[PDB]
From a paper:
The mycobacterial membrane protein large 3 (MmpL3) transporter is essential and required for shuttling the lipid trehalose monomycolate (TMM), a precursor of mycolic acid (MA)-containing trehalose dimycolate (TDM) and mycolyl arabinogalactan peptidoglycan (mAGP), in Mycobacterium species, including Mycobacterium tuberculosis and Mycobacterium smegmatis. MmpL3 consists of 12 transmembrane helices (TMs 1 to 12) and 2 periplasmic subdomains (PDs 1 and 2).
The reconstituted sample led to a cryo-EM map at a nominal resolution of 3.65 Å. Density modification allowed us to improve the resolution of the map to 3.00 Å. Overall, the conformation of the cryo-EM structure of MmpL3-ND is comparable to that of the X-ray structure of MmpL3773-PE, although there are some conformational differences between these 2 structures. The conformation of MmpL3-ND is distinct in that the gap between subdomains PD1 and PD2 is larger when compared with that of MmpL3773-PE. The volume of the periplasmic central cavity formed between PD1 and PD2 was measured to be 1,794 Å3 in MmpL3-ND. Based on the structural information, the increased volume of the periplasmic central cavity of MmpL3-ND is in part caused by the increased separation of PD1 and PD2.
Numbering used by the authors: 1 to 346, 385 to 761
The structure:
């Protein structure tokens, strides 16, 4: 069935070439600016009561703008801040700041407007010696993205304050820095990635043009992917982390597929076959396999849609679009372009073959210990943690992280993240707060709460209610600080165990509650994720091939390898060994990051496996027994897998240098996992265990063989192609 597609591609090439080149070149200018529709929200679960309750409380009261940006002020030099000159100069510069722009900011809340006040809340707003003070200010807007953009617009003028200086931090500055690092990270990515891959693949494919094919293919594939994401941005927003993920993963898989096809065609044309039937051959035995790789890798990540996180949904859409577009463009246009290219395209393989044969003659021992060694690498994991995204992620040399540390060092206890207890009146009958007192006592009798004055009457009062909210008998929420955040986990359960008497409901929110509800929702759909992923991957492996037992055992082996490499990366990060090596603080992990990395590495490792099996199944179907087939297959697939692994390792280590620690986590984990899977799997033990299994390993359901060889994608046998 695939030969007909190859020959009709051969027939009329200009139409497809023009259509695809024009589509990708237009998508490039279409998506020049995709950061217009990127967001930093949607990380959590809507099905959780925490997020919905917090949002309803916010819309009924209005945003608490007190923590957008806060800047600590440093005086001229050595004159105390209790007299006129310092206050006049700093307030005059602040007047400059509010005077230059009005459409951007609301108003600077500070000790200086009313220095001669005795309110303890603003009295503790100064140090004991009173030389370090700060100024709070929000930004104009309603959602976090537009106020972040406003900050990005007007930050440097706030930077320039003082004949000394000012250090500003808070909720908005750290977010702005950690979002804006991505552009420079991507720039560094191509700058430090293109030369190495270019030189290695030039020294591999010989001439300049053969190195020009896959780089162009990857660039156009990622441009089309970003264009498709820009089109998708019409309805559902995407996270800003999607852009680097696509920009590198599409490039890597596209380079691998370009090698995948060009190295096969070159050996096809060295035999001297006819060029039309040559590109036919490249389509039938390589295009079918690359379609298998594409469909399996896209199907590996789609079960993540069961996790309702906008981050996960966005990145899965990104991966799907990027990889499938790359593969379809490859199989459609590369054969035609190579046919137009023409015939004049103008010691390691030997020892690979010798090594694999000598090993496989009796690798019994050389098979069994090895697989159990990494088994022990299971025990480093199991101490999984929960920290989400925090600020100690950023490097110590960063100005913002040290500024925020200086802020909460020289000013203790000024900012705390509360947990809200929202009480929305379904009955629409106005509240009496005697029930509120009853409930606060009811939840006070359980331990684990802070108290600033050893008197219970000083905790759990209403949150600030600016005029933007609905002044109605709707909600009287109560907030409290933290003793220690993780203990609140237990509280969560009992925080829903109590009762409002008759008709008023009660929901529980707050940032730890949002984080923990998200992680609990993730754990809720954990077993379905893994089981459906593995069963569908194995079945689709068999659907690609003529056997099921070898693919399912290979997938289980890949599961063990995934567990081992995830344990290794946990030892790298959660254990903290290597913290000084990579200049990162050992901190707990993220909620969906682990699932993302395990899914993607399952996909990549099973891709490498698919062609390894394909070469060996092609070798077996040529007509030879187990020994000759596997002997000719292992080294032949290894010569390509080594180059692919080197390419992917370079393009991944391009991202072990991004200051954001989670992106380092992703890159380092995926690269070590892909290397430890590819090299070790097809180097030592896996063909060994396959050959110990033997000739019976090539059985499959004939009742399913019926559909397999009649759907048009089980084209293994070849019609004795002429020479």
């Amino acid at each position: 069935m695939f030969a007909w597609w190859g020959r009709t591609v051969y027939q009329f090439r200009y139409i497809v070439i023009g259509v695809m080149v024009a589509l990708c070149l237009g998508g490039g200018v279409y998506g020049i600016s995709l950061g217009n529709h990127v967001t930093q929200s949607g990380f959590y679960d809507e099905g959780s009561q925490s997020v919905a309750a917090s949002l309803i409380g916010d819309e009924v009261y209005g945003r608490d703008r007190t923590s957008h940006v806060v800047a600590i002020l440093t005086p001229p030099d050595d004159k105390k801040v209790t007299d006129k000159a310092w206050q006049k100069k700093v307030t005059e510069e602040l007047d400059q700041v509010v005077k230059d722009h009005e459409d951007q900011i609301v108003g600077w809340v500070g000790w200086l407007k009313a220095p001669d006040t005795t309110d303890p809340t603003v009295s503790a707003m100064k140090t004991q010696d009173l030389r370090h003070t700060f100024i709070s200010i929000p930004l104009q807007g309603d959602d976090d993205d537009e106020i972040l953009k406003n900050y990005q617009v007007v930050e440097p003028e706030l930077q320039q304050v003082n004949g000394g200086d000012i250090r500003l931090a808070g909720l908005n500055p750290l977010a702005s820095e950690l979002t804006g690092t991505i552009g420079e990270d991507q720039k560094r990515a191509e700058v430090a990635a293109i030369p190495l891959v270019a030189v290695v693949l030039f020294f591999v494919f010989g001439t300049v043009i053969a190195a020009a094919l896959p780089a162009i293919i990857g660039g156009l594939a990622i441009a089309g992917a970003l264009g498709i994401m820009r089109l998708v941005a019409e309805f559902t927003p995407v996270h800003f982390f999607a852009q680097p993920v696509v920009t590198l993963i599409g490039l890597g898989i596209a380079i691998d597929y370009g090698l995948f096809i060009v190295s096969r065609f070159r050996e096809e044309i060295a035999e001297g076959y006819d060029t039309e039937a040559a590109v036919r051959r490249t389509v039938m035995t390589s295009g079918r396999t690359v379609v298998f790789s594409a469909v399996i890798i896209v199907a590996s990540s789609v079960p993540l849609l069961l996790f309702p996180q906008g981050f996960l949904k966005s990145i899965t859409y990104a991966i799907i679009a990027s990889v499938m577009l790359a593969a379809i463009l490859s199989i459609t246009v590369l054969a035609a372009a190579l046919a137009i290219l023409g015939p004049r395209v103008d010691v390691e393989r030997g020892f690979w073959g010798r090594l694999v044969n000598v090993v496989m003659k009796r690798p019994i021992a050389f098979a069994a210990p090895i697989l159990v060694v990494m088994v022990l690498l299971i025990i480093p994991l199991g101490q999984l943690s929960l920290g989400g995204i925090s600020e100690k992620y950023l490097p110590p040399d960063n100005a913002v992280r040290q500024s925020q540390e200086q802020f909460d060092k020289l000013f203790p206890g000024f900012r705390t993240e509360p947990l809200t207890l929202v009480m929305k009146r379904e009955d629409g009958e106005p509240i009496t707060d005697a029930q509120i007192a009853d409930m606060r006592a009811k939840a006070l009798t359980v331990s684990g709460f802070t108290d600033p004055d050893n008197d219970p009457e000083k905790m759990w009062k209403e949150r600030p209610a600016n005029d933007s909210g609905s002044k109605d008998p709707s909600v009287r929420v109560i907030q409290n600080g933290l003793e220690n955040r993780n203990d609140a986990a237990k509280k969560i359960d009992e925080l829903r165990a109590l009762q409002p008497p008759h008709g008023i409901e009660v929901f529980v929110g707050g940032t730890p509650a949002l984080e923990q509800d998200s992680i609990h929702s993730l754990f809720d759909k954990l077993p379905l994720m893994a089981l459906i992923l593995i069963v569908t991957t194995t079945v689709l492996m068999f659907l690609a091939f003529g056997s099921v037992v070898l693919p399912i055992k290979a997938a289980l082996m890949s599961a063990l390898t995934l567990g081992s490499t995830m344990g290794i990366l946990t030892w790298m990060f959660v254990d903290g060994h290597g913290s000084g090596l990579m200049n990162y603080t050992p901190q707990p992990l993220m909620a969906p990051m682990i699932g993302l990395i395990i899914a993607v590495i399952w996909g990549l490792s099973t891709d490498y496996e698919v062609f390894l099996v394909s070469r060996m199944v092609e070798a077996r179907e040529r007509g030879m027994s187990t020994a000759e087939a596997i002997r000719i297959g292992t080294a032949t697939t290894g010569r390509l897998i080594t180059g692919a692994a080197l390419i992917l390792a370079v393009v991944a280590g391009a991202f072990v240098f991004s200051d954001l620690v989670m992106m380092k986590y992703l890159a380092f984990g995926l690269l070590i996992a892909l290397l430890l899977d590819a090299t070790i799997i097809r180097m030592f033990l896996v063909p060994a265990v396959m050959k110990l299994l033997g000739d019976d390993c090539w059985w499959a359901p004939r009742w399913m063989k019926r559909v397999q060889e009649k759907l048009g994608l089980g084209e293994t046998e070849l019609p004795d192609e002429r020479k």
